[PDB]
Write a structure and sequence with these properties.
The structure is cut from a larger assembly and holds nine protein chains of nine kinds. Chain B has one domain: Glutamine Phosphoribosylpyrophosphate, subunit 1, domain 1 (4-Layer Sandwich). Helices cover 39% and strands 21% of the residues of chain B. Chain B has six helices and ten strands; from the N terminus they run H-E-E-E-E-H-H-E-E-E-E-H-H-E-E-H. In chain B, a hairpin with a 6-residue loop joins strand 6 and strand 7. The longest helix of chain B has 22 residues. Chain E has 246 residues and is α+β, with helices and mostly antiparallel strands. Chain E has one domain: Aminohydrolase, N-terminal nucleophile (Ntn) domain (Glutamine Phosphoribosylpyrophosphate, subunit 1, domain 1), CATH 3.60.20.10. In chain E, strand 5 and strand 6 form a beta hairpin. The longest helix of chain E is centred in the middle third of the chain and has 20 residues. With 216 residues, chain F is an alpha+beta fold. Chain F has five helices and twelve strands. In chain F, the strands form three sheets. In chain F, strands 1, 6, 7, 8, 9 and 10 form a six-stranded antiparallel β-sheet that branches. Chain F has a four-stranded antiparallel β-sheet with strand order 2-3-11-12, covered by helices on one side. Chain F has a two-stranded antiparallel sheet with strand order 4-5. Chain F starts with 8 loop residues before the first strand and ends in a 16-residue tail after the last strand. Chain G is an alpha+beta fold and 249 residues long. In chain G, strands 7-1-2-8-9 form a five-stranded antiparallel β-sheet. Chain G starts with 18 loop residues before the first helix and ends with a helix. Classes of the chains: A alpha+beta (233), B alpha+beta (246), C alpha+beta (234), D mainly alpha (92), E alpha+beta (246), F alpha+beta (216), G alpha+beta (249), H alpha+beta (245), I alpha+beta (238). The interface between C and G is large, with 47 and 44 residues. Chain G: InterPro entries: Ntn_hydrolases_N, Proteasome_alpha, Proteasome_alpha-type, Proteasome_asu_N, Proteasome_bsu_CS, Proteasome_sua/b. Chain G: Belongs to the peptidase T1A family. Chain G: One of its GO terms (biological process) is proteasome-mediated ubiquitin-dependent protein catabolic process. Chain G: It holds the Pfam family Proteasome_A_N.
Chain lengths: 233, 246, 234, 92, 246, 216, 249, 245, 238
C-alpha cells in the first residue's frame, strides 16, 4: 500500500501523528491520583434510557485492586487490557504482591509503535494504536495513576485527562485540581471538566465513577452510590 | 522475444506471458552476458572435454575459486558459465544435493542423473520469483559408466537434453553452428584430437585467441575416470601440436 | 534468513471457464515441441520431437520419452524443468500405488494427483503453474489408454491428440483420422506419419524420438528402428 | 605458494611468451647469414617454437623477424619453402 | 495469514477503511431485532426467501453459538444478500462461546462474547493477511443468576446492556422505531416482547411470518426455533398494531 | 575410582594454586580401559593465548568439554574488541550445561582446572560434570578425590601458602602411588603450568617408581 | 514492487466485499452445468463434462461426477483444475466421518465443513477462493434424501432441485417447473435430468460422451452409488426425448 | 554500472533486465565511498590494516571498528556500510563457532569463502533481506592449509588473492602490491608494506584524522588472530610516515 | 514519496533513505550525556512532562543492578529493545555468572536493529541508547544507534546539536577517570546544557540521574531525589 514506514524529515512517524485524531472522536476519560485513593471517571455514552449502568461498565478490572478507564477508539482498548490482565494475575501468584501502576503501563506501551507495512506479526502492527489508557490502582507504594498514551509512552501524573480534546480536558484539570487533597474534592474535580469538554452534560447514567482507596479492593459503585457522587459536580 | 503484457501482475513476476516466456528466466540469460564467460564443449569416445576462459582482473590471485571448473563429484565434473556470483551460489546448492545423492545412491553418480537432480532443484527457482533463478548455465561433462563420454547442458531454467557437442555463454546460437561444422567433420576421437578440436572452436568464435594458461580444460578420460584439470603443462602439449596441425 | 515477495493472488477469473494466466500457459505448450499420441488399441504409442532445434542431438538416455514404470511412459510438450519434476513426482506416485496395490498407478489416477499440484501453483501467490502438458499412456483394465493433462490442470480425454506447433489444427486432424485395431509395427508407422504432419523440417532419427507401450511393457525404441518406420510410409 | 606480482597460471600472459618473441628477432641477422650457405631449418626453429603460441598479440611481434630472412631465402632455391610453411600454419 | 501489502493504512480521519467496509459486509446478513423480556429473550431475522424447494435452516441469520447463547446479526447498509461473510464471524464466535463452556459450565455470559469479538477485530488489523471484521451482534443469553440478558456489540468495538435493540437497514433508525414502541409494561409481559420484534422486521420486509422466523430462549430450556407457521398468526394481528404506534 | 560410565580415562589432575601461577600435573599414560593405549598424550589444551586448560576424568568427556570451551573464547574474540576470557565466566557457563546433561543417561563427573588472569580479573576455577564449581586454593575431583586430594588438603589447611616447589616434590611422590595403585596407568607425566599471561607446558617425559614394599 | 498493486483478495473493496469472490461466479457461468434432483427413494446427479470435444476415450469416467464414498456423490461446476484438488480432499473427509459415524454421511454436515475451507482462503492466506461450486448429493436418516449446493463464497444451501454451472437461473426454474416438492420418482427423475442438460450447455448437442449420470438409490441394506456407463445413459437420452412431451402435456 | 531508483528495485526479489540487480550495484557504490582497508597475504601469515575513524579524542578501541575475528584464527576486514558489515560478522561468528564444534580443526579459508559468498548472494534473492553493503576480506594463518586470503564482494563472488585492498582507489593499491614480491618477504616485512598504502590511497573528504589499527595472524601470534605485537607495530609505523616523504 | 518509503531503494552513495530518517529521530529526541570513570558510570538525561500536575517520566530505565540504560527517542520502540537487553543480560548472569561487559552486549543489539533496515516494508527503530555498564575491567559507556554502528567512548553526548557537548567533554576527558561519582554527574550537567539554547539552563525537575557501578547498586534519581547530585554546575560554558 501507500507507505506505512513513513518518516518526516524532522524525525517522527506521520502515522503516529494521524493516530490522535481517532481519540478525539471517541470517549472521554479522567484519572486523578489522590493521597486517599484513585478515582476514575469515564463516559458511558447514553443514547437510550434503557442502557443499564450497573450491568455494563467501561471502568474495568485489571486486578481486584487496580482499575482502568478507557478513552478513544473502544476496540483498541480491549486488546491492551486482555494482555495486561493476564500479566497482572500471573504477577500476583509469583510475587504475592500487587502490581505497581507503573509496572502494568510499561508492558502495554511496547505495543503502540512497532508497525510496518510488511513483515507484520501479533507483536507488530499495520498501523499504530490511537488509544490512551488511564491505569489507576492502589499498590504498596501507595495510590498511583500512570498514564499511557498513543505514542506508547508511560508518565506519572497526579492528574490526567484525555478525551474529546486531550489537551483541552487536561487544561480544565490544570485550573481546578491541587496535588494533595481529599477524596471528595478529587471526585468532584474529575466530574467538572468532563461535562464542559463533551457535547453531553453530567448525569448519573451519563458517566461512570468508581473509586479505589488503598486498603480496599476495586469496587464498582452501586446505583445509589453512583447517584451520590452526582450531587457534587 | 517479448517483454510480455500483464493481466496478472506479470511485470516483476515470473508468471506467464502470451509468448509463454517467464520474465525472471529471460533476465537470467542477460546474467550470462554480464560475466563474459563462454564455453565450448565437445563429446568423444576417448573423453569429454569442457574448455572455458579464466577471468583475470589482476595477477594477485589464488586458484581455488577463481576457477570456473568445479568438482561436482569425483568422476563427473562441470563448468558454470555466466555471472560468477550466480555461479557460486548454484555450485554451493548443487554440492549439498550431490552429497545427499551420496547418502542415498551410495556411489559415483551417472551424468544423466546428476543433471536431472540439478534440473529439479532449479524448477523450484524457476517457478518462484520469491527467489530469482540463478542466472548461470552449467555444462556437465563426465563418462557415464556404460554409454561413454557425455556432454549435457542445463540452462538457468534447467532445460537439459543430450547433444553431439554443446556450447553455453554469451551467445549459445553462434557458438553452436561453429561447433556444428566441427561435429560434421567428425574427427578420430583420441586424447590429443578431442581436446584440440574443443580448443580450436572456442578460439575461432572469439577471434582473440589465447595461451594455454588463459584457459582451463577439464577432461574425463577413459584413461582415469577421475575428473582431472590438465593444468598449464598438459594444455600446452596440445597447443604446440595444434600449431603444427592445419 | 527469510523471504517474502508476492503472496497475493496473481490469478483473476475470466468468464470462459478458465483463469487468464492459465490461458496464456496453453499458448506456451503450443510454441512447445511437437508431440503426437495415438492409441492403437493394442498398446499406446507416443512420439515426440527429439530436438530442441540446435540439430546436434546425441541421445542414449537423455530422452523426452521416459519410462516412469513398468507400463507408464510420458512424453510432453513445453517446459524442461517443469517436466523433470513431474517425472520425479510420477515415479513416487506410481510406486505409492505399487506399495498398496502391487500394481502401478492407473492413467486416471495419476492424472488426478499430478493435476492437483498444477492448480496449486495457480491459486497461490509467488508461484506460477506448469507450462507442461502430458501425453500419458498406460495399460489398465485390459485396455490401452491415453490421457491429456493440460498446463491448467484440466483434463481432456483423448484417443488421439497432438500438441506443439499447430496443436489446434492437430486435434481436428486426429479426431477425424484416429485408428484402432493396429498391429505393433503398424502402430509405429501411423504414429510417424502423424508426427510428419505436426512437426516441420527434417526427420532422421536424431530429430524424432518414439516410445511404445504394450503388453510386454513400456520401453523406448532404438534410434535405428525409428528410421525404418519413417521410410516405410507415405 | 606465490604471493605478490605474477600468479601461477595468470599474469604469465603479458610478459613470458611475448618477451621471448621480441628478443629472437634481434638475434636473427647473425644466425640468417649462416643459413643461406646451409642449415636454415635450425635457424628459423628457435623463433617458431615461440610462434606456435596462438595469440593475436604474438603476430604483431612476428612482423619483425621476417624482413631480414626474406632476402637470403628468395636468393636461394631451397630456403624459400621453409619460411612460407610457417606462415601457412599461422593462417590454418 | 500471508499477504504482501498492509491490510489497512491509517488515515487522519480516525477510521478504519476495513472495519467500515466490513459493516456493509454484515448487512449482507440481513436485519435482526431482539428484545429482552422477563424470562424469554427473543430475537427475529428478516428474509427466509421461501420457494418451497429449499430448506429454511441453511439461510438462517439466527445462529446458535451454544445451547443457551444465541445471536442474530447485521449492522448498517442496504447492500445485497449473502449469509456467508457473517457466517464466518459466527464460526469464530461459536468456538469462542464453547471454549468458555469448558471454562465455566453454567450458561455462558454474553459479556464474554462481545468483549472477545471487539478485540478479535483489532487483532485481524495487525496481521497483513487477515481480513478484519466490523459487525453488530445481538447477543442473547442467560447468566448463572437466571436473569434475562440482551447485549449488543458494535463495529466501534463497544458493547452495551439494553432492554430492546435493533440492527439492520440503518442501525440507529430500527433502534429508534423500537424506542417509541417501548413502554415499561413491555419487558415484564412475555407476550409483548414478541410483538416488538415482529413490528420492526415487518417494516423492511414484505409479507413476513415467512420472512419472519424468531426464536425464543428460556432460563431453564435451550434454544427453541419456532416454526414459521405459528409466527405468521402473530404477524397478522401485530401489523394491525404496528400502524397504531405510528 | 569414583567414576561412573568411563572408558578412556585421564587418571589424575593435580591443581594447586600459588600466587600468580598454578601447577597442574597430569599423566601422559591415557588408558583406554585397563590397557594404556597412549603412553604419551598431552591432556593440555589451549583455550586461548591468555587462558589454559588441564583436565582429569574420562578423556572422551574431556574432548566434549574442549569443544564447548573453545566456542566461548571464540565468542569474545567474535565481538572485535578482541577480549580474552575471564576464568570464571567460561567455567561457570559450562557448569550449567553439566546440570542439564545429568538427566540423559550419559554421566559426567568431568573435571577441569582453569587458572587464568584475563581482562583484569584473576580466577582460579574448577568445573565439574555434576557441576560442583567453586574458587579454590587446591582442587582435584574423581579419582584425584579418592587418593591425593586429602593429603594435599591436609598440608593446605595449616599452611595455606604452599609454593610451587613444595608442591613439585609432592606431585612426583603422589604419581608414584598412582603407577602402583591405579590400573589406568604406569607413570610418565606432563608438567603444565598455567599463568595469567601465557600457557606453558613441557611435553610428556618418563618417570619411574621406587621400590620398598617387599621389606616386611 | 507489490505495494502498488491491487487485486483486493484479503483486503475488502469499496463494495464491502472482495473482487476475487465475486469474479469466481463468472468463471462458473461458462463452464459445464451440474444438477441434482430429488426422488422418493433415491437422489441423482446429472452433469455436463468440461469436454466439448468430439472424441473422448473415457480414461477417467469421472470428469465431472466423482463418487467420493459409497454413501455420497459430487459434481463439479466450474474449472476442472480447482476440482482436482477438491476431489482429493473429499475422498478423505467423506470416509473419515464414516469410520467414526457408521451411518451414511449427512449431506448438510459435509458442505458446511467444506465451505469453511473455501472461505478460509479468501479471507486469509493470500490464495484465491476455488473456482468451483460442488453439488453434493447424499442421504442421512434425520433429513432424509438430500441435495446441498457449495459455493466459493462459503454459502451453502439446502435444496430439493437446483442447478449450478452454466445458465443457472433458467435451470433452477426449469427443474422447479417439471418437478415440484416430492413429485417424481427416481427413474422418471433421471430422464428430467438429461432434458435440462440438452437445453443448457456451453456448446449444443447432448451425447453420451458429453454427459455422465450418477444414481444414489438405496439397495437391499446398502446405499449404492454408481456412475452409469455410456450405454445406460444412452437409454436415458431416448427417455429424455419422451420426457420433453411429458413436461408439456 | 546500471541502476535507476524507479523500477527494478522496489522489492528485494526483483531481478533486473540487465542480468545484475540494481541493489547489488548500489551495495558496491557504498564500498567505493568508504575508506581503504587492506589485507595482504604473506608466506608466514596474513597482515591486516584497517583505518579506524577518530572524530573525537573521547574514543577508544570499540568505536568505528573494522577488524573482527570471525573465528579466533580467521579475521575479517570490511569496508563500506558498517551497519551491515557488523551484522554479517555476527552471523559469520556463529557459523564459524558451529564448524569448530563439529569439525574440530583450524578451518580452511577455501571452504569459508564458498559458503559466505553463497550467503551474500542469498540476500540478493530473498525479499525479507537486502544485499550486504560491504566487501570484505577473510584472512588466516593455519597449519592445515597455511596462509589464505580471500575477498567476497556484495555480489556474492569469491575469488582467491595474494594481496587485495578495497577503498576509494581499489586499482592503484593492487598495482602497488604487484610491484613488490611477497615471495621475497616473510610476515615481518609485510607489516611495513601494508602500512604505507593506507595513508596514500585514502582521500580525506569525510575524515579529519584516522588511526591505523593493524592485526596479526602470523608467526608471533601462533595461528590465532591477535592485535599486532608492539615491535612489529613500531617498524610498521615509521615506514608509513617515511613513504609519504 | 513511495521510493523513499521503500526499504529496497537506495541513493547513489549507497545509503538507504530509511536508515537516514532513523538517525534523525534521535536528534529530535531530548539530549542525554553518558560518561565513565574507572569506578562508576553516570547517565544524565533530560526529562519532559505533560502538565504541572504531574511528575516527569524517568528516561533512565532499570535493567540490572550492575548495568543500566538511558533512552532518547521513541519510548514504544525503546521498550522492544529494552525487553531484548534485559533478556540477554539476565541470561548472562545465570549461565556465565560474569557481571556482563558492555562491549559484548551492544554488538548483539547492533544486529537486531540492523534487521528492519534489510527488510522490505519494515521501518528501522529510531531511539538512541547510552548503555552504562560495570564489569570487572571497569565501567564503559557504549552508545548504540538505530543502525549497528556502536561507539566505545569515555564520554558521549547524543541529541540536539550534540557535537558541542563533546567539546566540553574533550577538554575534561582525562579528568573523568580521576573524578568522583558526584563530580561525574556535575560534568554531565555542564555538557547537557550545550545542546539546548543558551537562553536556558537546567532545572531540578528536568534532570534525571542514573548511577551505575558494583561499588553501588543501580539508582534512579527522579525529580526531587536529583538534588544532591545536581549541586555544582556552571551556567552555559561557551
Amino acid at each position: 500500500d501507500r507507505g506505512v514506514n513513513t518518516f518526516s524529515p524532522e524525525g517522527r512517524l506521520f502515522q503516529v501523528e494521524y493516530a490522535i485524531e481517532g481519540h478525539k472522536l471517541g470517549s472521554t476519560a479522567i484519572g486523578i491520583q489522590t493521597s486517599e485513593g484513585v478515582c476514575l471517571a469515564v463516559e458511558k455514552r447514553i443514547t437510550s434510557p434503557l442502557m443499564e449502568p450497573s450491568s455494563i461498565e467501561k471502568i474495568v478490572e485489571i486486578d481486584a485492586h487496580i482499575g482502568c478507564a478507557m478513552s478513544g477508539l473502544i476496540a483498541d482498548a480491549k486488546t491492551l487490557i486482555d494482555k495486561a490482565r493476564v500479566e497482572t494475575q500471573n504477577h500476583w501468584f509469583t510475587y504475592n504482591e500487587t502490581m505497581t501502576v507503573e509496572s502494568v503501563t510499561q508492558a502495554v506501551s511496547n505495543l503502540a509503535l512497532q508497525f510496518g507495512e510488511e513483515d507484520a506479526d501479533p507483536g507488530a502492527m499495520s498501523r499504530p494504536f490511537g488509544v490512551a489508557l488511564l491505569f489507576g490502582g492502589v499498590d504498596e507504594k501507595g495510590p498511583q495513576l500512570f498514564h499511557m498514551d498513543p505514542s506508547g509512552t508511560f508518565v506519572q501524573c497526579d492528574a490526567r485527562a484525555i478525551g474529546s480534546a486531550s489537551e483541552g480536558a487536561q487544561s480544565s484539570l490544570q485550573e481546578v485540581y491541587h496535588k494533595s487533597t481529599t477524596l471528595k474534592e478529587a471526585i468532584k474535580s474529575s466530574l467538572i471538566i468532563l461535562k464542559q469538554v463533551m457535547e453531553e452534560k453530567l448525569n448519573a447514567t451519563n458517566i461512570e465513577l468508581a473509586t479505589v482507596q488503598p486498603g480496599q479492593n476495586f469496587h464498582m459503585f452501586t446505583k445509589e452510590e453512583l447517584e451520590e457522587v452526582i450531587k457534587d459536580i | 522475444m517479448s517483454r510480455g503484457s500483464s493481466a496478472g501482475f506479470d511485470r516483476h513476476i515470473t508468471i506467464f506471458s502470451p509468448e509463454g516466456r517467464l520474465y525472471q528466466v529471460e533476465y537470467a540469460f542477460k546474467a550470462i552476458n554480464q560475466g563474459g564467460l563462454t564455453s565450448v564443449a565437445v563429446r568423444g569416445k576417448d573423453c569429454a572435454v569442457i574448455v572455458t576462459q579464466k577471468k583475470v582482473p589482476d595477477k594477485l590471485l589464488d586458484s581455488s575459486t577463481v576457477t570456473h571448473l568445479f568438482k561436482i563429484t569425483e568422476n563427473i565434473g562441470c563448468v558454470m558459465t555466466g555471472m560468477t556470483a550466480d555461479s557460486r551460489s548454484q555450485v554451493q546448492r548443487a554440492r549439498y544435493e550431490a552429497a545427499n545423492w551420496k547418502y542415498k545412491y551410495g556411489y559415483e553418480i551417472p551424468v544423466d542423473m546428476l543433471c536431472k537432480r540439478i534440473a529439479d532443484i532449479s524448477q523450484v527457482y524457476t517457478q518462484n520469483a520469491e527467489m530469482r533463478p540463478l542466472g548461470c548455465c552449467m555444462i556437465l561433462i563426465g563418462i557415464d559408466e556404460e554409454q561413454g563420454p557425455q556432454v549435457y547442458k542445463c540452462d538457468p531454467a534447467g532445460y537439459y537434453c543430450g547433444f553431439k557437442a554443446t556450447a553455453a555463454g554469451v551467445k549459445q546460437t553462434e557458438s553452436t553452428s561453429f561447433l556444428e561444422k566441427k561435429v560434421k567433420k567428425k574427427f578420430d576421437w583420441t586424447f590429443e584430437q578431442t581436446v584440440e578440436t574443443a580448443i580450436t572452436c572456442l578460439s575461432t568464435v572469439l577471434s582473440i585467441d589465447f595461451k594455454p594458461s588463459e584457459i582451463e580444460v577439464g577432461v574425463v578420460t577413459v584413461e582415469n575416470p577421475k575428473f582431472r584439470i590438465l593444468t598449464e603443462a598438459e594444455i600446452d602439449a596440445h597447443l604446440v601440436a595444434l600449431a603444427e596441425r592445419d | 534468513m527469510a523471504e517474502r515477495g508476492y503472496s497475493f493472488s496473481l490469478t483473476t477469473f475470466s468468464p470462459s471457464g478458465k483463469l487468464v494466466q492459465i490461458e496464456y500457459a496453453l499458448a506456451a505448450v503450443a510454441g512447445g515441441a511437437p508431440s503426437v499420441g495415438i492409441k492403437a488399441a493394442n498398446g499406446v504409442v507416443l512420439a515426440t520431437e527429439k530436438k530442441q532445434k540446435s540439430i546436434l542431438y546425441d541421445e542414449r538416455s537423455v530422452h523426452k520419452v521416459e519410462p516412469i514404470t513398468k507400463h507408464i511412459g510420458l512424453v510432453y510438450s513445453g517446459m524442461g524443468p517443469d517436466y523433470r519434476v513431474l517425472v520425479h513426482r510420477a515415479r513416487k506416485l506410481a510406486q505409492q500405488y505399487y506399495l498398496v496395490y502391487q500394481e502401478p498407478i492407473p492413467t486416471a489416477q495419476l492424472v488426478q494427483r499430478v493435476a492437483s499440484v498444477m492448480q496449486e501453483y495457480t491459486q497461490s501467490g509467488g508461484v506460477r503453474p506448469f507450462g507442461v502438458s502430458l501425453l500419458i499412456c498406460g495399460w489398465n483394465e485390459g485396455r490401452p489408454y491415453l490421457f491429456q493433462s493440460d498446463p491448467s490442470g484440466a483434463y481432456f480425454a483423448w484417443k488421439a491428440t497432438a500438441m506443439g506447433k499447430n496443436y489446434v489444427n492437430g486435434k481436428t486432424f486426429l479426431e477425424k483420422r484416429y485408428n484402432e485395431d493396429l498391429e505393433l509395427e503398424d502402430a509405429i508407422h501411423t504414429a510417424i506419419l502423424t508426427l510428419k504432419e505436426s512437426f516441420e523440417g527434417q526427420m532422421t532419427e536424431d530429430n524424432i524420438e518414439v516410445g511404445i507401450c504394450n503388453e510386454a511393457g513400456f520401453r523406448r525404441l532404438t534410434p535405428t528402428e525409428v528410421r525404418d518406420y519413417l521410410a516405410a510410409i507415405a | 605458494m606465490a604471493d605478490g606480482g605474477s600468479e601461477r597460471a595468470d599474469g604469465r600472459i603479458v610478459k613470458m611468451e611475448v618477451d621471448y618473441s621480441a628478443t629472437v628477432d634481434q638475434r636473427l641477422p647473425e644466425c640468417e647469414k649462416l643459413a643461406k650457405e646451409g642449415r636454415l631449418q635450425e635457424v628459423i626453429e628457435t623463433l617458431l617454437s615461440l610462434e606456435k603460441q596462438t595469440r593475436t598479440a604474438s603476430d604483431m611481434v612476428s612482423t619483425s623477424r621476417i624482413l631480414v630472412a626474406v632476402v637470403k631465402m628468395c636468393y636461394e632455391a631451397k630456403e624459400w619453402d621453409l619460411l612460407n610453411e610457417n606462415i601457412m600454419l599461422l593462417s590454418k | 495469514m500471508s499477504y504482501d501489502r498492509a491490510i489497512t493504512v491509517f488515515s487522519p480521519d480516525g477510521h478504519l477503511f476495513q472495519v467500515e467496509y466490513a459493516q456493509e459486509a454484515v448487512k449482507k446478513g440481513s436485519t435482526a431485532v431482539g428484545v429482552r423480556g422477563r424470562d424469554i429473550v427473543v430475537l427475529g431475522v428478516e428474509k427466509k426467501s421461501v420457494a418451497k424447494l429449499q430448506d429454511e435452516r441453511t439461510v438462517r441469520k439466527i445462529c446458535a453459538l451454544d445451547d443457551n447463547v444465541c445471536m442474530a446479526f447485521a449492522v448498517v447498509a442496504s447492500v445485497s444478500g449473502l449469509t456467508a461473510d457473517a457466517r464466518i464471524v459466527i464460526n469464530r464466535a461459536r468456538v469462542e462461546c464453547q471454549s468458555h463452556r469448558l471454562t465455566v459450565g453454567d450458561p455462558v455470559t454474553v459479556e464474554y462474547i462481545t468483549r472477545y469479538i471487539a478485540s478479535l477485530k483489532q487483532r485481524y488489523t495487525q496481521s497483513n493477511g487477515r481480513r478484519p471484521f466490523g459487525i453488530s451482534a445481538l447477543i442473547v443469553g442467560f447468566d448463572f443468576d437466571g436473569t434475562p440478558r440482551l447485549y449488543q456489540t458494535d463495529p466501534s468495538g463497544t458493547y452495551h446492556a439494553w432492554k430492546a435493540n435493533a440492527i439492520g437497514r440503518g442501525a440507529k433508525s430500527v433502534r429508534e422505531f423500537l424506542e417509541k414502541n417501548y413502554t415499561d409494561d413491555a419487558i415484564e409481559t412475555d407476550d409483548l416482547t414478541i410483538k416488538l420484534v415482529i413490528k420492526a422486521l415487518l417494516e423492511v420486509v414484505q409479507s413476513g411470518g415467512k420472512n419472519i422466523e424468531l426464536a425464543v430462549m428460556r432460563r431453564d430450556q435451550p434454544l427453541k426455533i419456532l416454526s414459521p407457521e405459528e409466527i405468521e398468526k402473530y404477524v397478522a394481528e401485530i401489523e394491525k398494531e404496528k400502524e397504531e404506534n405510528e | 575410582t569414583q567414576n561412573p560410565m568411563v572408558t578412556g580415562t585421564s587418571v589424575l589432575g593435580v591443581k594447586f594454586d600459588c600466587g600468580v601461577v598454578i601447577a597442574a600435573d597430569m599423566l601422559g599414560s591415557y588408558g583406554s580401559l585397563a590397557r594404556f593405549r597412549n603412553i604419551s598424550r598431552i591432556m593440555r589444551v589451549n583455550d586461548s593465548t591468555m587462558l589454559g586448560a588441564s583436565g582429569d576424568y574420562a578423556d572422551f568427556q574431556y574432548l566434549k568439554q574442549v569443544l564447548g570451551q573453545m566456542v566461548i573464547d571464540e565468542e569474545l574474540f567474535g565481538d572485535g574488541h578482541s577480549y580474552s576470557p575471564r576464568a570464571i565466566h567460561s567455567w561457570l557457563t559450562r557448569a550449567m550445561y553439566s546440570r542439564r546433561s545429568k538427566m540423559n543417561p550419559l554421566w559426567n563427573t568431568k573435571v577441569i582446572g582453569g587458572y587464568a588472569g584475563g581482562e583484569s580479573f584473576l580466577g582460579y576455577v574448577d568445573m565439574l560434570g555434576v557441576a560442583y564449581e567453586a574458587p579454590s586454593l587446591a582442587t582435584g575431583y574423581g579419582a584425584y578425590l579418592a587418593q591425593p586430594l586429602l593429603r594435599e588438603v591436609l598440608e593446605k589447611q595449616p599452611v595455606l601458602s604452599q609454593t610451587e616447589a613444595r608442591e613439585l616434590v609432592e606431585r612426583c611422590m603422589r604419581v608414584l602411588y598412582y603407577r602402583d595403585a591405579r590400573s589406568y596407568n604406569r607413570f610418565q607425566v606432563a608438567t603444565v603450568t598455567e599463568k595469567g599471561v601465557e600457557i606453558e607446558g613441557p611435553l610428556s617425559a618418563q618417570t619411574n617408581w621406587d621400590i620398598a614394599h617387599m621389606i616386611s | 514492487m507489490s505495494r502498488r498493486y491491487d487485486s483486493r483478495t484479503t483486503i475488502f473493496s469499496p463494495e464491502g466485499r472482495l473482487y476475487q469472490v465475486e469474479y469466481a461466479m463468472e468463471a462458473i457461468g461458462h463452464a459445464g452445468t451440474c444438477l441434482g434432483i430429488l426422488a422418493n427413494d433415491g437422489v441423482l446427479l446429472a452433469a455436463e463434462r468440461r469436454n466439448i470435444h468430439k472424441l473422448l476415450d473415457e480414461v477417467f469416467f469421472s470428469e465431472k461426477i466423482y463418487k467420493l464414498n459409497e454413501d455420497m456423490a459430487c459434481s463439479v461446476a466450474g474449472i476442472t483444475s480447482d476440482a482436482n484438488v477438491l476431489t482429493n480432499e473429499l475422498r478423505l473427509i467423506a470416509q473419515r466421518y464414516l469410520l467414526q459415524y457408521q451411518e451414511p454421511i449427512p449431506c448438510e454436515q459435509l458442505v458446511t465443513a467444506l465451505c469453511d475451507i473455501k472461505q478460509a482462503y479468501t479471507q486469509f492466506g493470500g490464495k484465491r477462493p476455488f473456482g468451483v461450486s460442488l453439488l453434493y448429493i447424499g442421504w442421512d436418516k434425520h433429513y432424509g434424501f438430500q441435495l446441498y449446493q457449495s459455493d466459493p463464497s462459503g454459502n451453502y444451501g439446502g435444496w430439493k432441485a437446483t442447478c449450478i454451472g452454466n445458465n443457472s437461473a433458467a435451470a433452477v426454474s426449469m427443474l422447479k417447473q417439471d418437478y415440484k416438492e416430492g413429485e417424481m420418482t427416481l427413474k422418471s427423475a433421471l430422464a428430467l435430468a438429461v432434458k435440462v442438460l440438452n437445453k443448457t450447455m456451453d456448446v449444443s448437442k447432448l451425447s453420451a460422451e458429453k454427459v455422465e449420470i450418477a444414481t444414489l438409490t438405496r439397495e437391499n441394506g446398502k446405499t449404492v452409488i454408481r456412475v452409469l456407463k455410456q450405454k445406460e445413459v444412452e437409454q436415458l437420452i431416448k427417455k429424455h426425448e419422451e420426457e420433453e412431451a411429458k413436461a408439456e402435456r | 554500472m546500471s541502476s535507476i531508483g524507479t523500477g527494478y528495485d522496489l522489492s528485494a526479489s526483483t531481478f533486473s533486465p540487465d542480468g545484475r540487480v540494481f541493489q547489488v550495484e548500489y551495495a558496491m557504490k557504498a564500498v567505493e565511498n568508504s575508506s581503504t582497508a587492506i589485507g595482504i597475504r604473506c608466506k608466514d601469515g596474513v597482515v591486516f590494516g584497517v583505518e579506524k575513524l577518530v572524530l573525537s579524542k573521547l574514543y577508544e578501541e570499540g568505536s568505528n571498528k573494522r577488524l573482527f575475528n570471525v573465528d579466533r584464527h580467521v579475521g575479517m576486514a570490511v569496508a563500506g556500510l558498517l551497519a551491515d558489515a557488523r551484522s554479517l560478522a555476527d552471523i559469520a561468528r556463529e557459523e564459524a563457532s558451529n564448524f569448530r564444534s563439529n569439525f574440530g580443526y583450524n578451518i580452511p579459508l577455501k571452504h569459508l569463502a564458498d559458503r559466505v559468498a553463497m550467503y551474500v548472494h542469498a540476500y540478493t534473492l530473498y525479499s525479507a533481506v537486502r544485499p550486504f553493503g560491504c566487501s570484505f576480506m577473510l584472512g588466516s594463518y593455519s597449519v592445515n592449509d597455511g596462509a589464505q586470503l580471500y575477498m567476497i564482494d556484495p555480489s556474492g563472488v569469491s575469488y582467491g588473492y595474494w594481496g587485495c585492498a578495497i577503498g576509494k582507489a581499489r586499482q592503484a593499491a593492487k598495482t602497488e602490491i604487484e610491484k613488490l614480491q611477497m615471495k621475497e618477504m616473510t610476515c615481518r616485512d609485510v607489516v611495513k608494506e601494508v602500512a604505507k598504502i593506507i595513508y596514500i590511497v585514502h582521500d580525506e573528504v569525510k575524515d579529519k584524522a584516522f588511526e591505523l589499527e593493524l592485526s596479526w595472524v602470523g608467526e608471533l601470534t601462533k595461528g590465532r588472530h591477535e592485535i599486532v605485537p608492539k615491535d612489529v607495530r613500531e617498524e610498521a609505523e615509521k615506514y608509513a610516515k617515511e613513504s609519504l616523504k | 514519496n513511495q521510493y523513499d518509503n521503500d526499504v529496497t531503494v537506495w541513493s547513489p552513495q549507497g545509503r538507504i533513505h530509511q536508515i537516514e530518517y532513523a538517525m534523525e529521530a534521535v536528534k529530535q529526541g531530548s539530549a542525554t550525556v553518558g560518561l565513565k570513570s574507572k569506578t562508576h558510570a553516570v547517565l544524565v538525561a533530560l526529562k519532559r512532562a505533560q502538565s504541572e500536575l504531574a511528575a516527569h517520566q524517568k528516561k533512565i530505565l532499570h535493567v540490572d543492578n550492575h548495568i543500566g540504560i538511558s533512552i532518547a527517542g521513541l519510548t514504544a520502540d525503546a521498550r522492544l529493545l529494552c525487553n531484548f537487553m534485559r533478556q540477554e543480560c539476565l541470561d548472562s548472569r545465570f549461565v556465565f555468572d560474569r557481571p556482563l561487559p558492555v562491549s559484548r552486549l551492544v554488538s548483539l543489539i547492533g544486529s537486531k536493529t540492523q534487521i528492519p533496515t534489510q527488510r522490505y516494508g519494515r521501518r528501522p527503530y529510531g531511539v538512541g541508547l547510552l548503555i552504562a555498564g560495570y564489569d570487572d575491567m571497569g565501567p564503559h559507556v557504549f552508545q548504540t544507534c538505530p543502525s549497528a554502528n556502536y561507539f566505545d567512548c569515555r564520554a558521549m553526548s547524543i541529541g540536539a546539536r550534540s557535537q558541542s557537548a563533546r567539546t566540553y567533554l574533550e577538554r575534561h576527558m582525562s579528568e573523568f577517570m580521576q573524578c568522583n561519582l558526584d563530580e561525574l554527574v556535575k560534568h554531565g550537567l555542564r555538557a547537557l546544557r550545550e545542546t539546548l539554547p543558551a537562553e536556558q539552563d537546567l532545572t531540578t525537575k528536568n534532570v534525571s540521574i542514573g548511577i551505575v557501578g558494583k561499588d553501588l547498586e543501580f539508582t534512579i534519581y527522579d525529580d526531587d531525589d536529583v538534588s544532591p547530585f545536581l549541586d555544582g554546575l556552571e551556567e552555559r560554558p561557551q
